[PDB]
Design a protein around this motif. Structure first.
Motif, mmCIF file in Angstrom:
data_model
loop_
_atom_site.group_PDB
_atom_site.id
_atom_site.type_symbol
_atom_site.label_atom_id
_atom_site.label_comp_id
_atom_site.label_asym_id
_atom_site.label_seq_id
_atom_site.Cartn_x
_atom_site.Cartn_y
_atom_site.Cartn_z
ATOM 1 N N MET A 92 126.562 14.269 76.201
ATOM 2 C CA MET A 92 126.005 15.600 76.022
ATOM 3 C C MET A 92 124.909 15.582 74.959
ATOM 4 O O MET A 92 124.840 14.687 74.111
ATOM 5 C CB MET A 92 127.101 16.599 75.641
ATOM 6 N N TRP A 93 124.047 16.600 75.011
ATOM 7 C CA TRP A 93 123.014 16.799 74.004
ATOM 8 C C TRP A 93 123.249 18.034 73.142
ATOM 9 O O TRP A 93 122.603 18.170 72.097
ATOM 10 C CB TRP A 93 121.625 16.886 74.659
ATOM 11 N N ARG A 94 124.153 18.929 73.541
ATOM 12 C CA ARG A 94 124.518 20.079 72.725
ATOM 13 C C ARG A 94 125.657 19.714 71.785
ATOM 14 O O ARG A 94 126.651 19.111 72.204
ATOM 15 C CB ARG A 94 124.928 21.259 73.605
ATOM 16 N N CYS A 95 125.506 20.077 70.514
ATOM 17 C CA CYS A 95 126.574 19.914 69.540
ATOM 18 C C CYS A 95 126.399 20.949 68.438
ATOM 19 O O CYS A 95 125.337 21.562 68.292
ATOM 20 C CB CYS A 95 126.582 18.504 68.953
ATOM 21 N N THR A 135 119.265 11.806 70.862
ATOM 22 C CA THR A 135 119.375 12.608 72.080
ATOM 23 C C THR A 135 120.830 12.762 72.510
ATOM 24 O O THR A 135 121.237 13.828 72.986
ATOM 25 C CB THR A 135 118.561 11.967 73.209
ATOM 26 N N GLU A 136 121.628 11.703 72.340
ATOM 27 C CA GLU A 136 123.049 11.667 72.694
ATOM 28 C C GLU A 136 123.890 11.457 71.437
ATOM 29 O O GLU A 136 124.239 10.317 71.092
ATOM 30 C CB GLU A 136 123.308 10.577 73.738
ATOM 31 N N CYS A 161 130.709 24.299 71.734
ATOM 32 C CA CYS A 161 129.647 24.469 72.714
ATOM 33 C C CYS A 161 130.170 24.878 74.087
ATOM 34 O O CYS A 161 129.437 24.782 75.075
ATOM 35 C CB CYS A 161 128.832 23.183 72.812
ATOM 36 N N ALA A 164 130.408 18.123 82.615
ATOM 37 C CA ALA A 164 129.893 17.017 81.817
ATOM 38 C C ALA A 164 128.616 16.459 82.425
ATOM 39 O O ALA A 164 127.702 16.047 81.701
ATOM 40 C CB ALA A 164 130.949 15.921 81.691
ATOM 41 N N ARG A 174 125.747 18.809 81.507
ATOM 42 C CA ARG A 174 125.465 18.881 80.082
ATOM 43 C C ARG A 174 124.678 17.678 79.570
ATOM 44 O O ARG A 174 124.505 17.539 78.354
ATOM 45 C CB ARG A 174 126.778 19.004 79.308
ATOM 46 N N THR A 175 124.213 16.804 80.457
ATOM 47 C CA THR A 175 123.444 15.631 80.072
ATOM 48 C C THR A 175 121.973 15.820 80.399
ATOM 49 O O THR A 175 121.622 16.438 81.408
ATOM 50 C CB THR A 175 123.971 14.388 80.780
ATOM 51 N N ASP A 176 121.116 15.290 79.534
ATOM 52 C CA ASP A 176 119.679 15.345 79.757
ATOM 53 C C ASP A 176 119.310 14.369 80.873
ATOM 54 O O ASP A 176 119.520 13.159 80.735
ATOM 55 C CB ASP A 176 118.961 15.009 78.454
ATOM 56 N N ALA A 223 117.377 19.933 68.680
ATOM 57 C CA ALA A 223 117.155 20.735 69.878
ATOM 58 C C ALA A 223 118.447 21.435 70.277
ATOM 59 O O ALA A 223 119.469 20.775 70.486
ATOM 60 C CB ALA A 223 116.648 19.860 71.030
#
Lengths: 890, 890
Positions: A281-284, A317-318, A375, B172, B175-177, B855
């Motif tokens: 994921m990229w959201r945290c 990014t991750e 999130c 999941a 939620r990944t770029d 971000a």
């Protein structure tokens, strides 16, 4: 359906030893069928006459044959059980429903009681596992094949390849030497122990936990069990228990601890890369973002080419991958440090580069979970990340916490050596009061006790050096110090002081063992005396563990009196703990056989006195039982379910507390039952002799099961073994005859009170039902034949006396239960082996059949046999087979 | 059944971005449904008007949405396929039956032809895999969930936990770029490559082999395929192909080779202990007994505590365990040596302590097999031991043999540097004759060529240093040296000499690449000239491999003319090889898309000229195709089956050889078709312009797929990509219009001859059927819309001309096949993305929307975008999604 296995096996056997041997095996099977059907005692001799003809090797082949037929029967039993139970489309969901409907308990009560519930399963290397591991593997594969066959989605080629696999795997089983030719080392026992982890437990725990989550959601509890909630744990004695086992040295304990540590590191490392892959994921939240920025600050722009996946520096990014990436680097350095520490004597790996804390590991994973929930990714968090959290919080850095056991007198020997060397007296000769006073003064004192120059026996240095070994290693690798034959507080204070003086940085909890009946009668008093000590109650910090042995209690007195004194003991110990405001956890040293306190788990848990568990239970899993309850995903799951359900119910549904009339009735009944038991097993002067003739006790040591090199002086394990092999089970039922008969004689309404007790007191019900089980697995004609073939003409009626008591006692047992599914058939096989075991013994104890390169046939397998070439192997084969058939060794 | 996925996904999407976005997505889905149903071209603009309203981030979310909906559609497709095919209770067993019944071939002919059959699958890192690996994993888990759901043995709790798993895994995924933010390294490509081994191939190979054994037993052939019979092999270009990829350095090749070696060692080591456990027999022949006594003689009575299982010295009671035990020690030391060699620059592990030979590994295992068969344990031998033998003989010490590729002119540059430094002339300026003469004289000569003091460019040192790197490493780690743009024998002799001179102890086989149409026309001549050289034909030892490129042939000339010249080429090459008595194996550089020679495997194999394979075939698996054929046990199996069946049938059932009339007809047709193709793609002066406007070609480089940093001058991969995205497929069908029309115009009976050819010439049938497939996946309205939105008013009719030809050509195609299951629906999704891709392009090529921390939302994901904040991500998302929908990138 049953005839399938017989057909396949007899076909393979014919392919391996000819039609003639298959026909003779069939003849034996039919004779035994006529015995377990018609029960004419002549049929036994009729079979033995057929047996006396065999060549030396052919008889070996026969014993092998019926042994493997029995094992196959057990496996088919387990598969048919898993299928019969799975085609339902006590029990966990049932227990929730009954707790809600019957007792009106609330869901949140179930959940909150469940958060605060703990079950500490400790695996032991007690020499009760008859089957060698080299065969147990093949057992696993064969049950897998039979599992895949028992289904209606077989595709033709799958069925044929599965027949080839089942045939080849059976043949591979038969082509292995069943006899351990040298007994194992303690470390081999620990290897057999941990094998169930990297095979079944490691993946089995998270699945069970998820199932608990599912059940709680079917009750309306959307919340999930906390990952750090300790619903289950694992301890081990393998490599720590040194009571009477001088082969378990300090270096052995070191070796097995470093071993387990390396294993855990390995498993975590194999998992960590898959988990990193998923955590993309990229959201945290801002917290985890700050942490990931920390690690990427010291990310070390380096190749790291030894790695397979994520070998390059991990981008922000991750971020979860960044944190988990540091977790990987520390995990790798841990496995490598332990790997060198084990291979050589040392490692150049710096300890800061490893996980040193039980939860320097856990903290980053918790942070990940928090971020995911922040999130809106709680479903993601409850997936692989949750399984991984539960695995860490459950197995830690060394798969199991290891217990160390030793007898009090060894501590006493060390201390007496210290006081003699200090020219101050003899700790041995000292009164218990003097002992307590001195030990206390030294525990509160600040001066080194002994120095480098202390004279030490090999023993003294053994106990001291195991303490140093405990001090040298990490604390989270050990469990408890168990003191055998504990009598007074000085026995515990000795261990606390020896720990402190051996610079054990975080000393472990001391726990006593009360195993002899006198020690159990005196146990609550001695524990109370221990809690009286203000210093020790201050150090114990409101938690104390005490062990309760089941093996030796029913060996010197009646089985019945053992159980009743055990109930009383649990009850009174809880009394003391409540009085001193200390949370007691009781450690139950149960076996697998009823004769050593065994039985089905939920029944033996129900038979504990209520308000004695309260979310804290600890149980031994005696060697053989381990394979019985963790050799398959299904077995592991059904075991964890059975235990946790029994505990929760015993918590919210407390079993009924006995009326005083039942108490006193059991006290009288126990006096009469114990007098009955000792009357035959100790008063009779010729009893030991008859025991050494009519049962296969003495030959037990030939099976090379464990690593440990009158009748009062033997281990309980060959004791119940000897009587269980012959299918007589004397130590299970002895006192009940005189007990019930005297109780009914004293008063007639005692029959109405017995019927009252069987239907309303759970402990009594469990007891009588278990005795009925044991009677169901017994056949007195067997004991008759053993007597007829090995016992001298003189004391023939002695056994018959017992045989009288047997039937008489059985009559009483059913009489209290009010009694009067078509499995059978397997007893036929067992009966055959019984005959084989009897006649062969007769040839062994003879002068003609005594003794005065490679191997290409079975007879060449035992060259160092002090008995005739083909015999010793045949006897050992009989004992193995009969054990596997009765599904119990000892 | 289909609506399931739509429901679950739209529910999750609503949980993640609100009802409003789910409603707008539904609106798009319904508009696209009305387009793929009614096909009113107004519906496209009607949808675009709805699209122009979106916020910058909302449009990102829309493209994400339809992309993931498409991917889910592919996965459900694969599952429904595996189930529809499994519920059958070409094909392997069918192919055996047809070879016996139809052609009267014997079983032993099938078996003997099968022993001598080889298929060398080589995996390539061609930048055609659109999906990032970080997502591909989640794809795997989701197809597992949908696989477990599609069954009627679901138990309630299993279904609920599987719904939670499928939901959490979809979430999941979302939620990944999706955007690779930096392009991978060659080593990352090799990691993506080898991932399919320690996941699917490693266990997939033995299962497939067992299935072949089962089929042979259903034919009456009890014998089993030899473990060393090489029915399949694997090569790789990942990390070796340096043609035009300066990022692939010598050290890269080193790194990936040491990598693969360590991987193989690891997998073998994890397996070896289980295999040792099973090999517990005590019967063996005198040969293996002697060997086991050898190892137990130097058994080294040592602890060996680093090991988990069998850490103690292995007894002679279990001899197979002794031999396998040495195999373990050598395997361990191998993994450790490679592990240090990779982590650092060196290892202290002695090479004798490792497996150095491909079969110092195999010899002990063979010995085990022989012993088992000697003792009647062939079923046991054909189990885990056989699987292990096949695994060793198939993957060896380094999972795949790596190919090294380079263009001739680099070898020419090195040599010219050498002759200039030797003051003897310029190899460049030299006639091909002079080149051959000199190279020969130096190959037969014995003097060092260049010395330490040779002046080297960075390039020169690149090629020399890759040769030294090949020399430094083990031979069994490499496959073949492939020469791009090979024209003459001097090109091959250059490589042979450079190998010898770089002290390559066992030089590898040299193999040319003929990819351009002229090179294919001249290829048989040049290969004949090479075989003329008596020295080289002497060194080649009767075996020669030559590669045939499919990508660039159909790019500079018509697709049709490409295929026909390819057939001619295979045919004439086999002619030369037969004439010089050299066994030719042809290496087919096919892609995944028909435009680069792709298509369904068994069809493209059938379309090869007969007697050109003869048990030796080599095929590229272009990046994306790898995931398509090895991401699942079922996919891997169906792939290996499809290939091996197609090859065996093409061997015993040779396809019909064409009549001369068809030959000449295809020659004329090829002249007219090529003139047709170049007329539009090269004669038209404005064609390149219109291509750079109406297709998304130029933006391809933004997807960061691979590691490689007029229209004649672009790679074929973005060429077929550009026309496949827009669903127009010009390079697939262009020349067919003028070809067929001119052929029917010249003679009327040519229509009867076309109908004759379609039903009887396999190559022609395959060609026309493939073109019909491509027409089925095309929609000219799309190209119309792209023209309408991005192409200037001037050359609007140009595309319409093409659109004319399109329909016209399609009319002819069906006309030769005689043509006139309800999947549809997915095109709706694709259509939506098409619209999204068009309008977004228009905003990108604008001056207002050009550019002049952490971000927390999608728009912050691309800060370094030279275009508007929300746009570049949206375009890349469209390209990814459309590719996944058409199930082809390029």
């Amino acid at each position: 359906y049953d005839a399938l296995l017989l057909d396949r096996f007899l076909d393979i056997l014919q392919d391996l030893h000819g039609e003639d041997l298959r026909e003779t095996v069939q003849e034996l099977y039919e004779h035994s069928a006529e015995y377990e059907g018609k029960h004419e005692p002549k049929k036994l001799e009729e079979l033995g006459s057929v047996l006396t003809s065999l060549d030396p090797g052919d008889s070996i082949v026969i014993a092998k044959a019926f042994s493997h037929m029995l094992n196959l029967a057990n496996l088919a039993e387990e598969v048919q059980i898993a299928y019969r139970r799975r085609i339902k489309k006590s029990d966990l969901e049932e227990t929730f429903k009954k707790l809600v409907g019957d007792l009106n308990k609330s869901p949140e009560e179930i959940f909150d009681a469940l958060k605060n519930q703990t079950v500490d399963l400790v695996l032991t290397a007690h020499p009760t596992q008859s089957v060698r591991r080299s065969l147990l593997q093949k057992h696993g594969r064969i049950r897998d094949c039979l599992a895949q066959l028992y289904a209606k989605d077989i595709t033709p080629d799958d069925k044929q390849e599965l027949d080839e696999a089942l045939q080849r795997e059976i043949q591979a089983a038969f082509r292995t030497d069943e006899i351990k030719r040298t007994p194992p080392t303690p470390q081999d026992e620990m290897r057999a122990g941990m094998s169930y982890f990297h095979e079944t437990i490691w993946k089995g725990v998270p699945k069970f936990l998820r199932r608990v989550d599912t059940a709680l959601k079917n009750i309306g509890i959307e919340e999930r069990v906390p990952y750090n909630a300790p619903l289950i744990q694992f301890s081990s004695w393998m490599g720590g228990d040194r009571d009477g086992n001088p082969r378990v040295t300090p270096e052995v304990t070191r070796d097995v601890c470093l071993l387990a540590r390396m294993m855990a590191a390995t498993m975590y490392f194999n998992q960590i890369e898959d988990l990193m892959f998923e955590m993309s994921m990229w959201r945290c939240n801002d917290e985890l973002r700050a942490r990931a920025d920390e690690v990427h600050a010291n990310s070390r722009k380096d190749a790291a080419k030894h790695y397979i996946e994520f070998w390059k520096s991990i981008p922000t990014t991750e971020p979860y991958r960044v944190i988990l990436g540091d977790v990987r680097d520390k995990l790798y350095h841990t496995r490598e440090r332990a790997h060198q520490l084990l291979s050589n004597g040392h490692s150049d790996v710096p300890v800061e580069a490893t996980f040193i804390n039980l939860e320097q590991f856990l903290e980053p994973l918790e942070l990940c979970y928090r971020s995911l929930c922040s999130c809106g990714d709680r479903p993601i968090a409850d997936g692989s990340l949750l399984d991984f959290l539960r695995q860490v919080s459950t197995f830690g850095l060394s798969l199991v916490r290891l217990d160390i056991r030793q007898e009090s007198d060894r501590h006493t020997d060390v201390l007496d050596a210290i006081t003699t060397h200090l020219d101050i007296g003899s700790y041995r000769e000292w009164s218990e009061e003097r002992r307590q006073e001195w030990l206390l003064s030294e525990l509160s004192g600040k001066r080194p006790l002994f120095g480098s120059d202390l004279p030490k026996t090999e023993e003294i240095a053994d106990v001291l050096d195991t303490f140093h070994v405990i001090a040298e290693l990490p604390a989270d690798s050990f469990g408890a110090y168990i003191i055998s034959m504990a009598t007074a507080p000085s026995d515990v204070l000795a261990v606390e002081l020896l720990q402190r003086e051996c610079r054990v940085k975080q000393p472990l909890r001391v726990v006593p063992l009360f195993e002899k009946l006198a020690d159990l009668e005196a146990a609550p008093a001695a524990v109370a005396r221990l809690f009286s000590v203000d210093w020790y109650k201050n150090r114990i910090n409101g938690k104390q563990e005490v062990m309760i042995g089941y093996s030796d209690s029913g060996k010197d007195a009646g089985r019945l009196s053992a159980a009743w004194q055990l109930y009383k003991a649990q009850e009174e110990l809880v009394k003391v703990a409540k009085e001193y405001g200390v949370k007691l956890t009781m450690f139950h040293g149960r076996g697998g056989t009823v004769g050593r306190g065994g039985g089905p788990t939920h029944l033996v848990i129900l038979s504990q006195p209520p308000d004695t568990i309260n979310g804290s239970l600890r149980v031994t899993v005696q060697g053989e039982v381990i394979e019985q309850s963790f050799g398959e995903e299904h077995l592991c799951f059904r075991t964890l379910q059975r235990f946790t359900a029994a505990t929760l119910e015993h918590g919210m549904r407390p079993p009924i507390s006995p009326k005083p009339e039942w108490r006193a009735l059991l006290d009288e009944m126990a006096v009469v039952a114990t007098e009955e038991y000792r009357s035959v097993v100790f008063q009779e002067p010729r009893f030991v002799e008859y025991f050494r003739l009519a049962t296969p006790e003495l030959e037990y040591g030939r099976m090379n099961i464990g690593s440990r090199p009158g009748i009062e002086s033997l281990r309980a394990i060959p004791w119940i073994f000897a009587w269980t092999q012959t299918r007589f089970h004397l130590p299970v039922w002895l006192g009940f005859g005189s007990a019930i008969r005297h109780v009914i004689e004293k008063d007639v309404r005692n029959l109405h009170m017995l019927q009252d007790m069987y239907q309303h007191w759970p402990f009594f019900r469990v007891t009588i039902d278990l005795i009925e089980m044991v009677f169901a697995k017994g056949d007195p004609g067997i004991a008759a034949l053993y007597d007829k073939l090995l016992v001298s003409e003189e004391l023939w009626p002695f056994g018959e006396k017992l045989r009288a008591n047997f039937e008489e006692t059985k009559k009483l047992i059913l009489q209290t239960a009010g009694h009067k599914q078509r499995l059978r058939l397997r007893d036929s096989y067992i009966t055959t082996l019984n005959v084989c075991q009897a006649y062969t013994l007769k040839r062994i104890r003879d002068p003609s059949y005594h003794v005065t390169k490679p191997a290409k046939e079975l007879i060449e397998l035992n060259p160092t046999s002090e008995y005739a070439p083909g015999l010793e192997d045949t006897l050992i084969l009989t004992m193995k087979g009969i054990a596997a058939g009765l599904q119990n060794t000892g």
